[PDB]
Amino acid sequence: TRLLAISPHLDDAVLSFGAGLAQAAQDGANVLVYTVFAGAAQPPYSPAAQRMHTIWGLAPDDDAVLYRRKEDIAALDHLRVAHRHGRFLDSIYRKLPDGRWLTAAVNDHSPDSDHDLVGEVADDIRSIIDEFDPTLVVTCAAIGEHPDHEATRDAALFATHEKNVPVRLWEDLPYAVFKSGAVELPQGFRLGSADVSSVKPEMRSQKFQAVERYSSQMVLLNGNNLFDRLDEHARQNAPHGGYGETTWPVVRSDDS
């Protein structure tokens, strides 16, 4: 088995699918987690980016991407899976064609810009598929509607469809604790029946320990009960006990 996980940001795959990644590695699968929006960023930073850097426990003008890449490597090494850091800039570092920052909340902009980004991400994913030759791709459902998650999900769907590789979407955590869960896929795609995994306690522990490697995100993610909320979420999906993660297969719609 060759499992390619496609994470929007540096932490999403571990937060949402860390137990599944860890189990896959345990079972002897070759597992690679490619993070789309891991692109190097340098000052000048927007005021919004400077504020986020502060929330992440960094100086406003620090190399936040460098810090997060190192966190990601530690977390993924802890799960014993490989990493690959993509070239795309996180939403807080992107500019619009007219020179404005993308984020301020997202500034009004042309769908053309969204399409162009999705196209480039899709190009990179098609190349990674050629290079890694995955038997399964898993990426985010984009529950919560973060534009980077939506771009990642849509690009992965288009790339996998063209390359004829099976794809599944994970339930975005911790977002799904606060959202309804319904998502709007690009035309022609739909979700099949959910799978709710049940993993051994060791895999829960491995996942939670890996999450902790993302120290910069802990204040943001905890709001001080992140792990309790993750446990409660799994409990609600599997009342008989045991930790797990929800994923859906993505298939072609009828008449498409």
Ligand X SMILES: CCCCCCCCO[C@@H]1O[C@H](CO)[C@@H](O)[C@H](O)[C@H]1O
Taking CB under 6 A as the rule, does residue 9 contact ligand X? yes
Distances (CA, A) of 3 to 36, 86, 103, 202, 218: 16, 17, 33, 20, 27
Find out whether 90 is annotated in a ligand binding site.
yes
Find out whether 27 is annotated in a ligand binding site.
no
Residue from 25, 36, 92, 157 binding ligand X (CB under 6 A): 92
Residue from 91, 139, 197, 247 binding ligand X (CB under 6 A): 91
Distances (CA, A) of 5 to 137, 190, 208: 6, 19, 18
Question: How many whole angstroms separate alpha carbon 50 and alpha carbon 47?
Answer: 5
- Residues making contact with Zn ion (CB under 5 A): 8-9, 12
Contacts of 226 (CB under 8 A, 6+ apart): 174, 211, 218
- Residue type at 118 in one-letter notation: V
What are the CB-based long-range contacts (under 8 Å, 24+) for 54-58?
55/219, 55/220, 56/216, 56/217, 56/219, 56/220, 57/215, 57/216, 57/219, 58/216
Tell me how many residues contact ligand X (CB under 6 A): 11
Q: Tokens 């290079």 sit at which residue?
A: 131
Minimum distance from CB of 106 to ligand X (Å)? 5
Minimum distance from CB of 184 to ligand X (Å)? 16
Residue from 6, 13, 75, 90 binding ligand X (CB under 6 A): 90
- Residue type at 42 in one-letter notation: Q
Minimum distance from CB of 242 to ligand X (Å)? 27
Question: Please, which residue, 58 or 238, has the CB nearer to ligand X?
Answer: 58
Minimum distance from CB of 130 to Zn ion (Å)? 26
Taking CB under 6 A as the rule, does residue 16 contact ligand X? no
- Asked if 221 contacts 174 with a C-beta cutoff of 8 angstroms, the reply is yes
Taking CB under 6 A as the rule, does residue 106 contact ligand X? yes
Bridge partners, 169 (sequence order): 139, 248
Instruction: Classify burial at 132, counting beta carbons within 10 Å of its beta carbon; exposed 0-12, middle 13-18, buried 19 or more.
Output: middle
Minimum distance from CB of 133 to ligand X (Å)? 29
Out of ligand X, Zn ion, none, what residue 72 binds, judged by CB under 5 to 8 A for its kind, is: none
Find out whether 77 is annotated in a ligand binding site.
no
Out of ligand X, Zn ion, none, what residue 103 binds, judged by CB under 5 to 8 A for its kind, is: ligand X
Residues that bind ligand X (CB under 6 A): 9, 11, 90-92, 103, 105-106, 146-148
Q: Which residues are annotated as a binding site?
A: 9, 12, 83, 90, 109, 114, 148-149, 171, 233
